[PDB]
Amino acid sequence: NSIQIADETYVAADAARVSAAVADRCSWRRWWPDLRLQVTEDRADKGIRWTVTGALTGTMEIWLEPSMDGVLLHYFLHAEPTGVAAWQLARMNLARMTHHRRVAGKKMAFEVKTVLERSRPIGVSPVT
Template sequence: MPQLDISCDDLVVADPAYVAERLGSDTLWREWWPDLTLTASERRGLEGVRWTVTGAAIGTAEWWLESVRDGVVVHWYLRVDPARPVHGRALLRLKERYVAAYRERVWRFKDEVEAGRAAGERRTGSEPAIVSGEDTGAAIEQPAGHTHQTRPAKR
């Protein structure tokens, strides 16, 4: 198991294809973590990218993009061992540094692509993925004409 096994998940309410294109950019990673060299090992289109990592740390990194309703959940993984021995508090600070860099930048990205959208409002031009009435067994509208009947609430 690598010394640093980091995962973060964030919902971005934007077109999944656009998110995949932007987050799949090789230059993006160089900007976010200049001390890491990432080489794409698997480009998975709308599902993300996997990289091998060298430089200040050795291992793997991944964006796994999961389409959810009118956006995409960005699952980020960094599984690496520092290139030089790091232990104790120094290892914790390194982990915190990588997570802080990710959070700062992914939230900036969210602010950019979600600009003008009020919290809870669906993405402009998107169809609602789930619309339900009261929890009384009403039908739930799903994309592409799929219909699913909910179970009545237990009383």
């Protein structure tokens, strides 16, 4: 495929929390505004498998592998620019496009990391 990504990020949180975060349909709109996702498989504490439409056509997955105090959040994408003619594909910079999709994947992962690792709010119970 023209766009191929396999990245990993450590999140120091329970697989259940991480899987729930990545499965949030409203988050998908923020993370991937030019993609429409359809769930093919929900695999609970192990992540999720999608089909992708919109700007890209293909498959996308998250897999969670326990590590340390949490999980390694695997982000996978295999896709093509949707619908393009060969003349269009031939003029695209697939490396740059792949880079942009990697950065967006990592922004998703780092958001999930940030939110789930965040420490207790100030002057909210319990104070210890």
